[PDB]
């Protein structure tokens, strides 16, 4: 398969596109939270929270 030869470039593209799809995954729920990425998010940005 002429996509899996250059194993650095292929895994780099999976690494960036996993940063992106966990970025909006934890964007509906941030909660501050050092383990969660540092976002505050939208579960408490659209409620009666502070």
């Amino acid at each position: 398969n002429e996509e899996l030869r250059n194993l650095l470039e292929a895994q780099m593209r999976n690494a960036v596109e996993e940063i992106a799809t966990t970025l909006n995954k934890k964007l509906y729920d941030g909660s501050g939270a050092i383990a969660d990425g540092g976002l505050i998010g939208l579960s408490i940005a659209a409620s009666g929270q502070d």
Partner: protein
């Protein structure tokens, strides 16, 4: 008719009627491909990162 009642002919007519359902509908659109190998073999990707 005591004459020619034992010497008649028994011809049929040209009326064969097909009574069986011999059809290939789903086979008729699968985009048939040739293959000269023991087994088709490809790769399936999962997640993990």
């Amino acid at each position: 008719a005591k004459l020619n009642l034992a010497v008649l002919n028994n011809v049929f007519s040209e009326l064969l009627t097909q009574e069986i359902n011999r059809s290939a509908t789903f086979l008729g659109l699968l985009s048939k491909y040739p293959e000269r190998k023991s087994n088709i073999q490809w790769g399936v990707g999962m997640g993990g990162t």
